[PDB]
Design a protein around this ligand. Structure first.
Ligand SMILES: NC(=O)C1=CN([C@@H]2O[C@H](COP(=O)(O)OP(=O)(O)OC[C@H]3O[C@@H](n4cnc5c(N)ncnc54)[C@H](O)[C@@H]3O)[C@@H](O)[C@H]2O)C=CC1
Ligand SMILES: NC(=O)C1=CN([C@@H]2O[C@H](COP(=O)(O)OP(=O)(O)OC[C@H]3O[C@@H](n4cnc5c(N)ncnc54)[C@H](O)[C@@H]3O)[C@@H](O)[C@H]2O)C=CC1
Lengths: 367, 374
């Protein structure tokens, strides 16, 4: 089979600056280019890399017009809007360096240049995120953030921070989505002796996995939320999950509950989370995802607090770009690129989000 | 029939809850709520005096301990029962820890005081709480949460700046110093994370069945364990052989860029040696909740020490064992121990006894000859 020739690749990655020289394991940066440059150039392909992706007349906007392959990364996402896809005359393959391709307009992608392939590195980040979720759950439940702030400020008052400190043992935790991340969340929670582990997903766990992990499927999302002390969101962003966690749905959670979101920022309504924390309906909110990204400097969830001055465990979009994750998605991006550039188009099916004008996943809504 | 003891003076040293202890009545272990003991004691004809004033020359504690028959302390705000103080406690028969860890009592002096006083604590009451705190603090450090959260709250955004020290716990080697109630529960919670290996060092080993069930390996030499670990967690009591155990020389046996967690006792580490190991980047992180002394002085170096990248510090006040769920359990356990004494039965749970009848009654405070268990 004849290899494709002189393919223009465009990568939109985050700037590593000095950090990417201190730590060469920052592969997914404009400096280190996922370790792809020599590999592409030796085949006669070209690579243009940028972090300039937002402003009118950005490098991304100029370069996407004749790029055949566009590599994006969720942590600093080149948003492939319908407007931009309509100008991407040569685009055949959009690869996500990581997991979650919702920064691409997938419906528009299906109608672009005969239907472009949108692929991501399935599995590459999922342990990383699951760990981050259990971390965040513990941080919130155990009231870590204001306790650490008290120490660094030179103060000492045990009651002040113990008054909102609980154990995770004996609490009910529910996951929205029991895919590769949600399942691995429940597998990490098993040893904590939660009162119950619940899930809501239109794609269920097998009975054997339910028994092995020790968890129960709840058929109705609102019924799950009403029983949970902790809720974690582990579903993709698609039309039916955008703004899902609005004031009305959050009001179904228990008063004083904890909400974690390492999925996608746009699944929650940021003002509704901030208001629920402000009135004490939520005890805490945390995770690493925002909409848009970079998160605006004034984004309300940078500084929103519960009525006691805690309950915020937000970080930048980092869980899936741990140094261990980056090695896996850099290798996976090379693998997806080789499937295309070889002319084989022999993608792993689980890497495909849209392909040949159709959705190629069950996980972006019931279709 | 056994004759109950009568008109017993109880002294409790607890932390002040102020307004917090009224906002949240679940703060049982406070000077306000008195572990729910006051009416229960008074109805039997006993008296209770409670204070948080325990440190200064001429403290309430120093005055009241002279004729207290029972002294209740709590690790989170510890009335230090020094040899000097025990020598002045002419009526003391029972010292009860509201929580776990009785190292704030001079146990050798306790064994020589008033014919050998009973020192009891509520074994098991806090152990889940602390084990969860350990795993939380391990993840916080390994995934570089603290500087990432600070970045967000300051209004900044730089993924690379905080990803460059962000690792997964999967594939890392974790070792625990001590595999008792807390250390075993730490390994039980780390099992789901697919660590490369789970190690322990303890002169009291796990059964072979529990080693296989949890999936962990006993390392016979402490330094050999430290050299193999990416993460070390200290889960042993404070006693003569563990005081200042984690000094510069022992820390130097840990890997460069390792993470150290201490929810056990502050005095097990040499604070200046931890700070220097963090500041030169031999440690990537240090965290936990325990200090020496407590309250931690305002200028304690581990409040503010950082790794060379401005992270690495996951310290909190002494709180893991005083979660609201723990407090319910140790408040009930203190009542149970008090009832064993006040009834004249002295029918303590053996596992609650640290010293009794002039002898250590535990194997967990060092390897001893003439350990006498009920
Ligand atoms: N914070 C981070 O760095 C990362 C975030 N993610 C995000 O997490 C998402 C999930 O990742 P995986 O678990 O690997 O995907 P997955 O595809 O293995 O599992 C996703 C699951 O969500 C379910 N789902 C879809 N809509 C739902 C709904 N309305 N309610 C409940 N469940 C629903 C699907 O049926 C599927 O079982 C990704 O799509 C991505 O948005 C993933 C990796 C990195
Ligand atoms: N941060 C907090 O709020 C709390 C901290 N603690 C501290 O944790 C300590 C351990 O508690 P548990 O696990 O419940 O006690 P435990 O008695 O069940 O287990 C302690 C284990 O440490 C071992 N040990 C003693 N010296 C050692 C050494 N040099 N090296 C290795 N192992 C050694 C003992 O043999 C024993 O198996 C307590 O004594 C207390 O100091 C416990 C509860 C609350």
């Amino acid at each position: 089979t004849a290899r494709l020739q002189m393919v223009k690749v465009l990568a939109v990655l985050y700037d590593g600056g000095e950090h990417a020289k201190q730590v060469p394991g920052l592969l997914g940066t404009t400096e280190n280019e996922l370790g792809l440059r020599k590999w592409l150039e030796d085949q006669g392909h070209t690579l243009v890399t940028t972090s300039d992706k937002d402003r009118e007349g950005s490098t991304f906007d100029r370069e996407l017009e004749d790029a055949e392959i566009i590599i994006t990364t969720p942590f600093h996402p080149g948003y492939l809007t319908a407007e931009r896809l309509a100008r991407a005359k040569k685009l055949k393959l959009a690869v996500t360096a990581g997991i979650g391709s919702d920064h691409v307009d997938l419906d528009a992608a299906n109608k672009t240049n005969g239907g472009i392939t949108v692929a991501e590195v399935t599995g590459s980040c999922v342990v990383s995120v699951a760990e981050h979720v259990v971390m965040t759950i513990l941080v919130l439940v155990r009231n870590f953030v204001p306790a650490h702030e008290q120490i660094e400020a030179g103060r000492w008052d045990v009651a002040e921070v113990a008054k909102d400190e609980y154990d995770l043992e004996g609490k009910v935790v529910g996951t929205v989505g029991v895919g590769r991340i949600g399942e691995r969340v429940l597998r990490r929670l098993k040893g904590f002796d939660c009162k119950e582990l619940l899930y809501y997903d239109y794609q269920p766990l097998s009975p054997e996995k339910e028994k092995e992990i020790g968890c129960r499927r709840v058929e109705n999302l609102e019924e799950m939320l009403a029983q949970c002390d902790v809720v974690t969101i582990n579903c993709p962003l698609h039309e039916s999950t955008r703004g899902l966690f609005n004031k009305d749905l959050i009001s179904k959670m228990k008063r004083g509950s904890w909400l974690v979101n390492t999925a996608r920022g746009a699944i929650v309504v940021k003002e509704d989370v901030a208001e629920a924390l402000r009135t004490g309906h939520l005890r805490g909110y945390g995770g690493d995802v925002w909409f848009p990204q970079p998160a605006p400097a004034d984004h309300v969830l940078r500084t929103a607090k519960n009525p006691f001055g805690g309950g915020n465990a937000m970080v930048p979009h980092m869980s899936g770009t741990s140094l261990d994750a980056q090695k896996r998605y850099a290798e996976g991006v090379k693998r997806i690129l080789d499937s295309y550039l070889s002319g084989r188009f022999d993608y792993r099916p689980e890497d495909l989000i849209v392909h040949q004008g159709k959705y190629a996943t069950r996980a972006y809504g019931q279709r």
